[PDB]
């Protein structure tokens, strides 16, 4: 499967060769609670854990199914 990520210059996107092809959408509070905004990290996992600790996480298993919310309809 395909997958997005947040790491290089712009948004990164690669395919997950192993069994872990799930695209998670992690998001917590980084300045939106303070001043700037909520944090967002796009990645590829196999055992998408629970975001209960103190954040969010959308576990999906489709080609680059981890797109951005505020960033997309530019």
């Amino acid at each position: 499967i395909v997958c997005h990520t947040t790491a290089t210059s712009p948004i990164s996107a690669v395919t997950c060769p192993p069994g872990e092809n799930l695209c998670y959408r992690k998001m917590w509070c980084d300045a939106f609670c303070s001043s700037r905004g909520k944090v967002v990290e796009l990645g590829c996992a196999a055992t998408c854990p629970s975001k209960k600790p103190y954040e969010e996480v959308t576990c999906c298993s489709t080609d680059k199914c981890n797109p951005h919310p505020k960033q997309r309809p530019g």
């Binding site: 790491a7 290089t8 939106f32 944090v39």
Partner: peptide, 25 residues
Amino acid sequence: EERGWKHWVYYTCCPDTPYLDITEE
């Protein structure tokens, strides 16, 4: 010329205020 690895920080709220991280010695 340099180019590092992969480091980002995308904040929900604003698209014109992206936090990019590539290289900075």
